[PDB]
Design a protein around this ligand. Sequence first.
Ligand SMILES: Nc1ncnc2c1ncn2[C@@H]1O[C@H](COP(=O)(O)OP(=O)(O)OP(=O)(O)O)[C@@H](O)[C@H]1O
Ligand SMILES: [Mg+2]
Length: 281
Amino acid sequence: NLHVFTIAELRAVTRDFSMTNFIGEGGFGPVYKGYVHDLAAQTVAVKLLDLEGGQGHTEWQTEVFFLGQLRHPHLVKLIGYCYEDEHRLLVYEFMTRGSLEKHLFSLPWSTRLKIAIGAAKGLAFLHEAKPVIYRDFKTSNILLDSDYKAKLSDFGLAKDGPDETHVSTRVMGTQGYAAPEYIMTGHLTAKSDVYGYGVVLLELLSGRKAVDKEQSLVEWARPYLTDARRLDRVMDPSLAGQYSTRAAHKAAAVAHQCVALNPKSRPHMSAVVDALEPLLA
Ligand SMILES: Nc1ncnc2c1ncn2[C@@H]1O[C@H](COP(=O)(O)OP(=O)(O)OP(=O)(O)O)[C@@H](O)[C@H]1O
Ligand SMILES: [Mg+2]
């Protein structure tokens, strides 16, 4: 199952958390490239809890719980963890192309479709199970391997699904991706995840960030997604001649349904996979 590491071992693994091994960070803490020697030898990612930050043991234990039981091809693999006095660390497989937001903010139309399909399969797997609500579905939580295969990562805010119709919890997440009905009510469902997936799809189609202080991508591009004649106002100009009108229009319409403000109008993620997969043919 999961391997238990010591601080001393992760110090060896990451060249004592050298700044040259820095590969990214978030609200939990910074992440360092590392190498495990003869568990097979491989390049790993080591995430360290920042003890002055806004996160802590709860997010750590959530990832260990969910990633230690969840195994799918579009989900990042958790190799092990460290729990040593006040310190908390997480060890994942190294995703060689990092997180999607750094590539988006150049990416071929076919590559973007492939990323959107892979991320959708990961999310569909969580929803169809013991269903799991991803909650923090955003661009920077999609990681990429050498072939740009997309994998969901960072299950710090992951929650179990509801005879109930919703889950009552704190409003947590990231502006622009968190579902509006969830923000306003504190009621979380799997349909809340579909809104954030729609936002990421919107970002892949337009090259624009969800929020940029016209500041909100969804609100601005919302009325332009249903009409194939208006595609030029939403499609990334760096994507020109790469897509057929039908493929971009169907992707745009899928995005539009996913960012509906009525959660009952959003599609199931498995229907999203079925709409998008043919576009790659
Ligand atoms: N397995 C990995 N392979 C390559 N890079 C990674 C990996 N895990 C994390 N990173 C890099 O470090 C960044 C931060 O990781 P992660 O999203 O897990 O941090 P976090 O603090 O939990 O973020 P949040 O603030 O959303 O909670 C990632 O977006 C990614 O760029
Ligand atoms: Mg996190």
